[PDB]
């Protein structure tokens, strides 16, 4: 039957990467894109990418007056800062991919529904009161009554699969997460006033290690309810343009033999071909650039310390392309979500 | 009595200017205006990723409506439109305009309307106002100049060098290429650029980025004898600060034009404040924080004989686009104060 | 029967060449020699920081004395001296010399002594052997030439562009500046450089570093009509790969020399494999992994009339110093194989 | 009396930074420098530094044929890869600062003593059989009978003060350390064969997050005997040229009130003006470049989780300039060690 109609709000890093994957989807049709700039700018950003490859080498991208044309397919372009002004209704838009970073609450995203959209997927955490989905961990909780959902954050899609497998193997008592994270667009190019008042994100991104807060651990309860309230964590932003790593320091309680090898073997048993991969090579961050795993466990860094009485302090580490890993996960979730539309 | 000075735009240039003006006995920094709160401004002043840790030698404390630096209290305003600033009631003499949003005489007039007596713009600002490179043309300044430009970083590097070369062997024409540190007008990662520049939209720290520059084309404002003789462009590269200017000039002379005679002339033209002379194998991080507006690099001079008195010449000089420019702008401001 | 090929030096160029030769039906990679063990060599082939994850599409496994790629077994040697290699008995036809330590006909002769029939050096290597830029002068090759040079990355960028300019409007003289990615001959942090270069001793990733280059001086080897007309130098900047060449030439012509007529000439000389033509606003990361030896950037062309048929002209082209060079060298090797 | 005669073996990052500090110490005299290069190369590296500032702006440095002259004072230069060939004895060298990275054992460093030097301070870990010193943590165990000592590693000088204060406040059961570390000279500029066979240090330093092993946590027992065997850890090398941070994830046992505030207040009580500083501003790595603290506790990053029954999992974080923080600690140790000559 008819392909599901998809609009993208915000043609940024995530939006353009989701475009690369949705545009090839036979079961979908990208009808419109909205941003804050003209078609030639959007076409050039789509064509050339500093970290994720030269898209123009395999595709023809051409800008029109009010549209872009990719491989013959014409997509209309809008420039509306307020979603209420978007014509989602006349375009019969089924799903809005909300990737602006400016509609991150169920109340804000509701504007898309008011404009005539049927469903909205927010490409970020967007509160404690909406469905937060990590594909292949809890995407099956989605129902027809969910109109606005969150695809969580890049760190949550990396932490969740790993935390779940560990917890299933040896119950987690508590854990502290540290993510060593590529710099992103919400940091400054050089020291300058940050619009949100964050004094550390105001510092030059490419020449600093920058401590930053993250809510990925504290909000793990939305994705893995048995871990609700057990994890806290934070981030260090460092000078790589993409590619990140999550380190979890957990206290686990178990009667089993808890060793580096038994830990690694459980992680390997929990791996799957789409979301959670298993690695034993000495890779570094540039090797995971562009991968489609949401999370890649690194068996080479597993550490274990026996505290006695069935208690252990354990370190498990996994890699993620904060751009493309998240995007591939968000896209899988979108493809599943579409069943509730058509 | 000390001259009352306000800073509009507490950015890279405004904060570096502050470091130097704050110590000037002949001036008093009365106010700062930007688009953020006092705590943000105090933190940016205390810690700098490329120009050093200012909090190590100074006390900076944020208040509700001010900052206090070394005991001295400075008022802080948050007005995007200069007409709303109380320059008149603060009896401000000179406004340092460092926002990048008032770069024309008509736009800068707002500061004077608000009650200031003089404005110095920290950028090129049209062809119709005094454009000043200290120790090249600052003496054209008169009492009737209310709004002036301190030109650009690249112009403050090129002018001393081009002038000295031209005085030695007249330039027929020249092409400038500047290898330039990335700046705040480029994006941290690939994204939509607000002014529609497709190259500036690219990630700053992992790309060589060609970009346009008007420094060579507008050199006539500073060195009238070179008017219309130079063109040029830029390459932005991944260093946070520190830049180099390469001039490829065809010169005509009956003299002996060699790498040595060229270098000896550059040295003869050097002076202790603006235009320095280097013969060491330095690299860009070595000039970070220097106070020369321009540092000629004798190690890179090249000369080719075209015959019949014509030569093609490459001369190179270094500049800290942040602090070299600032030191020049501050010299100009101190001179400008005589008219207040 | 397929041509038997050995690689000496499994570095940036050696591994990138492997990537292109391994799929060639007319070739068979028989051996690899370096200064490390098979596991080290296998990991480097698998994962590359700037040229992509090779392990995503290929199977690479290290053995005790070999590596196996996609089922094919390749012997590995660890011999610092080329005389100790068993080239003769493995019946190696062509040796790809990519170590950087055999950069002369006399040194490269060792490979022939060890029993190989032909040697291609991945660098400039003297005046006493053929220096080849594919699609510029590769056709001078004969069967009686046993050792050839594939020139330098910069030469492979400069030559096609200089040739096209010169054919259009003869060059009187020129000065070249290349803005170049840092490479393995620079230090990771400031430290003693073994070859005594005071600038290559400085940290590669946080500096603009002037350095000398012989590409312009030796253009005569590839384009004899330009012999002695060009000089040049380089600026190493903090990108791991991707470079650009700027040529500032004085040209003499009776024709209409404009940015447009220059660009149109370049487009006319472009071709599908070696010399490409660009009019998009690209930056250096866009040309990573490209297979052109040279990509002319029409957006940066500049021209100044000096009067009397003289013009000063700026033409610019891009090149991936690693893979652009490699693609040219692989084209040269494949042509060279006809003589085997 | 006579100034202590000091020789520097290895004019690298640490040797040159140490020179800057020692050269001004009146109680010392830098008599010789040995490396693998000529005076011209050494003089330029001392004048200009990509991360630690332009030294020539404040000093005159001039190269001769076999010497350098800094502010008028002439210093002899040697090029001897084997320490046995150095004329330490005839120059009456008291202390050798061993900063090459090639004499990191009591047995290798003994070569300097054989050459006629009286004492050696190695700028790295160098075994379990010699004194390993973190200033203001255990430097007072030094005796006149100690001829060869280790100044430990940069990470150890950051970890030791923090772990000690934590342990003194609430005893550590076990801990895992992660250090986010500036790239260093033992990584490659671009992907290439690493001489020591480390497949990760073989990768380009400035464009990768690179996992690496470290023995700092594992060997903390040499400096803090009560923590022996309780800590393990590793590192992530990232693309900043200098400036590092250490994260310690410790399980502690206590009957006291263990909170982020009680932890931070304990850390502050343990701070001192020279070695262990206390921070509450939102700094990032470039702010600590060139600082002289060996360790700078970051109170803004403290985390605590209650496990019940007196157990807590805690995160404490400290900053350090892996180059100049370590050098400053090593120089304080050298100045103290001089009492025994
Ligand atoms: N980049 C990452 O690593 C990453 C990973 C996971 C989730 N996210 C989340 O995805 C969202 C976007 O991330 P990003 O890195 O792509 O940022 P981005 O800056 O690259 O993209 C934002 C885009 O949205 C447009 N935009 C902004 N406000 C708008 C409005 N009111 N109306 C229409 N368009 C608007 C901007 O022009 C820009 O093109 C954020 O919520 C971010 O937190 C980012
Ligand atoms: N950074 C350099 O290398 C350099 C060198 C020479 C000249 N300049 C010029 O100096 C000016 C400032 O440059 P910068 O590098 O410091 O940029 P910047 O982004 O670091 O600083 C600009 C500051 O002005 C403030 N601002 C912006 N709009 C404003 C408004 N309407 N009202 C009040 N404040 C406002 C911003 O908050 C910011 O703090 C620009 O015109 C620039 O071209 C810069
Ligand atoms: N990297 C570039 O941008 C580039 C471009 C064009 C041409 N080249 C030239 O290609 C050559 C190799 O360059 P590279 O970038 O690959 O350097 P590289 O350091 O990455 O690789 C050189 C390889 O040769 C090996 N080697 C060194 N000495 C040896 C010996 N005695 N015997 C056997 N093997 C030895 C090394 O182990 C290393 O693997 C150089 O001459 C260089 O100038 C380099
Ligand atoms: N750089 C740091 O962050 C750091 C921090 C703490 C401890 N260290 C330790 O200090 C030591 C030196 O470190 P670095 O950063 O200065 O490295 P470096 O490469 O910058 O310095 C090494 C110097 O020693 C010289 N050298 C090498 N072998 C020699 C020999 N046989 N004889 C004489 N001179 C020789 C080299 O020419 C070079 O100048 C190492 O043990 C290192 O682990 C380094």
- CB-based contact C35:D193 (threshold 8 Å): yes
- CB-based contact D251:D310 (threshold 8 Å): no
Residue A62: helix, strand or coil by DSSP? Answer: strand
Q: Do A290 and C53 touch (CB under 8 A)?
A: yes
Task: Give which of C12, C114, C45 is closest to C329, Cα–Cα.
Answer: C12
Determine the atom of ligand 2 nearest the C-alpha atom of A191.
20
DSSP string for residues in A300-326: GG-EEEEEETTEEEEEEEEEE-TTHHH
Residue D58 C-alpha from the chain's centroid:
25
Buried b / exposed e along D120-133 (16+ C-beta atoms within 10 A): bbbbbbbbeebbbb
Domain boundaries, chain D: 1-152+323-341, 153-322
- CB-based contact D10:D86 (threshold 8 Å): no
Q: How far apart are CA C274 and CA C131, in angstroms?
A: 16
Question: Cα distance from A51 to chain B (closest Cα, Å)?
Answer: 9
Residue C295: helix, strand or coil by DSSP? Answer: strand
Beta-sheet strand order (sheet of B66-69): B60-62, B66-69, B72-77, B27-33, B3-8, B94-97, B118-121, B147-149
- CB-based contact C129:C145 (threshold 8 Å): yes
For residue D113, count CB atoms less than 10 angstroms from its CB and return exposed for 0-12, middle for 13-18, buried for 19 or more. Answer: middle
Q: How far apart are CA C5 and CA C18, in angstroms?
A: 10
- CB-based contact C41:C16 (threshold 8 Å): no
> Which positions in chain A touch C288 (Cβ < 8 Å)?
54
Q: How far is CA B163 from each of CA B158, B225, B260, C207, rounded to the nearest angstrom?
A: 8, 9, 18, 28
> Which positions in chain B touch A199 (Cβ < 8 Å)?
39-40, 43
Interface probe for C, chosen from D50, D154, D201, D209 (most Cβ of C below 10 Å), is D50
Q: How far apart are CA C179 and CA D264, in angstroms?
A: 50
Buried b / exposed e along D332-341 (16+ C-beta atoms within 10 A): bbbbebbeee
Q: Which of A54, A283, A291 sits opposite C286 (nearest CB)?
A: A54
Task: Give which of B136, A315, C132, C195 is closest to D236, Cα–Cα.
Answer: A315
Q: How far is CA B314 from each of CA A152, B215, B311, C4, C299, rounded to the nearest angstrom?
A: 56, 17, 10, 48, 23
For residue D105, count CB atoms less than 10 angstroms from its CB and return exposed for 0-12, middle for 13-18, buried for 19 or more. Answer: middle
- CB-based contact B60:B42 (threshold 8 Å): yes
Those residues whose C-beta lies under 8 Å from the C-beta of residue A64, and which sit 6 or more positions away, are A39, A74
E strand map for chain B: 3-8, 27-33, 60-62, 66-69, 72-77, 94-97, 118-121, 147-149, 171-181, 209-212, 230-237, 243-252, 275-278, 294-297, 302-307, 310-319
Q: How far apart are CA B329 and CA B134, in angstroms?
A: 7
Q: Do A51 and C285 touch (CB under 8 A)?
A: yes
- CB-based contact D158:D246 (threshold 8 Å): yes
Q: Identify how many contiguous H helices and E strands chain A contains and give both numbers.
A: 6, 16
- CB-based contact A45:A14 (threshold 8 Å): no
Residue D158 is among the residues annotated as catalytic for this protein:
no
Q: D11 CB less than 6 Å from ligand 4?
A: yes
Q: How far apart are CA C150 and CA C15, in angstroms?
A: 16
- CB-based contact A162:A316 (threshold 8 Å): yes
The CATH number of the structural domain formed by A153-322 is: 3.30.360.10
Those residues whose C-beta lies under 8 Å from the C-beta of residue B68, and which sit 6 or more positions away, are B59, B60, B61, B74
Residue B82: φ, ψ to 5°:
-60, -20
Those residues whose C-beta lies under 8 Å from the C-beta of residue A78, and which sit 6 or more positions away, are A32, A33, A34, A35, A86, A87
Residue B88: φ, ψ to 5°:
-60, -50
Task: Give which of D159, D135, D326, D323 is closest to D235, Cα–Cα.
Answer: D159
Buried b / exposed e along D44-75 (16+ C-beta atoms within 10 A): bbbbbbbbbbbbbeeeebebeeebbebeeeeb
Q: How was this structure determined?
A: X-ray
Q: How far is CA B301 from each of CA A68, A203, B161, C219, rounded to the nearest angstrom?
A: 49, 37, 12, 21
Q: How far apart are CA B9 and CA B123, in angstroms?
A: 12
- CB-based contact A171:A211 (threshold 8 Å): no
What's the CATH fold of domain C152-321? Dihydrodipicolinate Reductase; domain 2 (3.30.360)
Q: How far apart are CA D132 and CA A223, in angstroms?
A: 48
Reported as type and span, the H/E element at residue C336 is helix C323-336
Reported as type and span, the H/E element at residue D231 is strand D231-238
Resolution to 1 decimal place, in Å: 2.2
Phi-psi domain of B223 (left: phi exceeds 0; alpha: psi -120 through 50; beta: other): beta
Those residues whose C-beta lies under 8 Å from the C-beta of residue A333, and which sit 6 or more positions away, are A121, A133, A134, A135, A139, A151
Query: Which 8-state DSSP code applies to residue A3?
Result: P
Residue C214: helix, strand or coil by DSSP? Answer: coil
Helical pair D13-22 and D39-47, crossing angle rounded to 10 deg: 70
Those residues whose C-beta lies under 8 Å from the C-beta of residue C161, and which sit 6 or more positions away, are C245, C247, C266, C275, C294, C296, C315, C317
Q: How far apart are CA C156 and CA C136, in angstroms?
A: 9
Buried b / exposed e along C123-146 (16+ C-beta atoms within 10 A): bbbbeebbbbbbbbbbeebeeeeb
Q: How far apart are CA B174 and CA B247, in angstroms?
A: 7
Q: Which residues pair with B249 in a beta bridge?
A: B174, B313
Task: Give which of D281, D83, C120, C87 is closest to B61, Cα–Cα.
Answer: D281
Please note each residue after which chain B is broken, C-to-N distance over 2.5 A, or write none: none
Helix %, strand %, coil % for chain B, to 5?
A: 30, 30, 45
For residue D238, count CB atoms less than 10 angstroms from its CB and return exposed for 0-12, middle for 13-18, buried for 19 or more. Answer: buried
Residue A36 C-alpha from the chain's centroid:
22
Q: How far apart are CA A199 and CA A300, in angstroms?
A: 35
Q: How far is CA B22 from each of CA A219, B52, B68, B69, B72, rounded to the nearest angstrom?
A: 47, 16, 12, 9, 10
Task: Give which of C304, C127, C295 is closest to C219, Cα–Cα.
Answer: C127
Reported as type and span, the H/E element at residue D149 is strand D148-150
Residue of B44, B94, B151, B153 with catalytic role: B153
- CB-based contact C182:C121 (threshold 8 Å): no
Q: How far is CA A119 from each of CA A32, A143, A149, B183, D211, rounded to the nearest angstrom?
A: 15, 12, 8, 40, 42
Please note each residue after which chain D is broken, C-to-N distance over 2.5 A, or write none: none
Total length of chain B: 340
Q: How far apart are CA D224 and CA D222, in angstroms?
A: 6
> Which positions in chain B touch C302 (Cβ < 8 Å)?
175, 231-233
Q: Which residues pair with D247 in a beta bridge?
A: D178, D317
Question: Rounded to a whole number, what is the largest CA-CA distance in chain D?
Answer: 70
Q: C101 CB less than 6 Å from ligand 3?
A: yes
Those residues whose C-beta lies under 8 Å from the C-beta of residue B181, and which sit 6 or more positions away, are B236, B237, B239, B240, B241, B242, B243, B284, B321
Q: Whose CA is nearest to atom 20 of ligand 1?
A: A12
Task: Give which of B29, B135, B149, B8 is closest to B78, Cα–Cα.
Answer: B8
Task: Give which of A309, A314, A313, A281 is closest to A297, Cα–Cα.
Answer: A281
Query: Which 8-state DSSP code applies to residue A52?
Result: T
Mutate-to-test residue for ligand 1 from A99, A121, A245, highest number of ligand atoms within 8 A of CB: A99
Q: How far apart are CA B273 and CA B278, in angstroms?
A: 14
User: CB atoms < 10 A from the CB of A211, how many?
Assistant: 23
Those residues whose C-beta lies under 8 Å from the C-beta of residue A204, and which sit 6 or more positions away, are A188, A189, A190, A191, B49, B50, B240, D286
Q: Do B285 and C235 touch (CB under 8 A)?
A: no
């Amino acid at each position: 039957s008819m392909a599901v109609k998809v609009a993208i709000n915000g043609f940024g890093r995530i939006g353009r990467l989701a475009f690369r994957q949705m545009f090839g989807h036979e079961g979908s049709e990208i009808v419109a894109i909205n941003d804050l700039t003209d078609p030639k700018m959007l076409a050039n950003l789509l064509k050339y990418d500093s970290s994720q490859g030269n898209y123009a080498r395999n595709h023809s991208v051409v800008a029109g007056e009010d549209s872009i044309t990719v491989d013959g397919k014409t997509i209309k372009i809008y420039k509306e800062a307020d979603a209420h002004n978007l014509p989602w209704g006349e375009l019969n838009v089924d799903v809005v991919l909300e990737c602006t970073g400016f509609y991150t609450s169920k109340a804000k995203a509701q504007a898309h529904i008011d404009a005539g959209a049927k469903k909205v997927v927010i490409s970020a955490p967007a509160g404690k009161d909406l469905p937060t989905i990590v594909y292949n961990v809890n995407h099956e909780i989605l129902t027809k009554d969910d109109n606005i959902i969150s695809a969580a954050s890049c760190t949550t899609n990396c932490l969740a699969p790993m935390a779940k497998a560990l917890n299933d193997f040896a119950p987690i008592q508590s854990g502290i997460m540290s993510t060593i994270h590529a710099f992103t667009g919400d940091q400054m190019v050089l020291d300058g006033p940050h619009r949100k008042g964050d004094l550390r994100r105001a510092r030059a991104a490419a020449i600093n290690i920058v401590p930053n807060s993250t809510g990925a651990a504290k909000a793990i309860g939305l994705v893995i309810p048995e871990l609700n309230g057990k994890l806290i964590g934070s981030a260090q932003r460092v000078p790589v343009p993409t590619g990140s790593t999550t380190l979890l320091f957990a206290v686990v309680k178990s009667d089993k033999e808890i060793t580096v090898d038994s830990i690694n073997a459980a992680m390997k048993a929990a791996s799957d071909p789409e979301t959670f991969g298993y690695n034993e090579d000495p890779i570094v961050s540039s090797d995971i650039i562009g991968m489609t795993y949401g999370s890649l466990f690194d068996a080479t860094q597993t550490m274990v310390q026996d505290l006695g009485n069935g208690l252990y302090q354990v370190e498990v580490v996994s890699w993620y392309d904060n751009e493309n890993s998240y995007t591939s996960q968000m896209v899988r979730t979108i493809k599943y979500f579409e069943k509730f539309v058509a």
